[PDB]
């Protein structure tokens, strides 16, 4: 998955 | 590593139409989600090369994104609203399949989807 922090 | 070719946005054999509902999908629904602060991960096809996601297109065989949807709507690629709604649904579903609950991307998809559902709840008739 794309687990990185984005928000 | 390689990305697949993106989903077509134009097709010279596919009948084209603009309905009042499709107009709404571009001008109200896509516009509202596009402007949203969480829109950016969804504004273009997932770049598995750049994001180093070598399994992305092993898992996701029907990719979809709002850039593609936007161009389809601009090109009158769709015959009906339901085709366009399906594409939005596919985009969200892919995100939920590929990623995990609690991932920011999922939180992002969920907020956009709630707004999408709010906007499509009030699709106009071909009045
Ligand atoms: Na194609
Ligand atoms: Na209209």
Residue numbers in the entry:
A (entry chain B): 11 to 17
B (entry chain A): 42 to 168
Q: Can you quote the paper on this entry?
A:
Bromodomains (BRDs) are protein interaction modules that specifically recognize ε-N-lysine acetylation motifs, a key event in the reading process of epigenetic marks. The 61 BRDs in the human genome cluster into eight families based on structure/sequence similarity. Despite large sequence variations, all BRD modules share a conserved fold that comprises a left-handed bundle of four α helices (αZ, αA, αB, αC), linked by loop regions of variable length (ZA and BC loops), which line the Kac binding site and determine binding specificity. The four helices form a deep cavity that is extended by the two loop regions (ZA and BC loops), creating a largely hydrophobic Kac binding pocket.
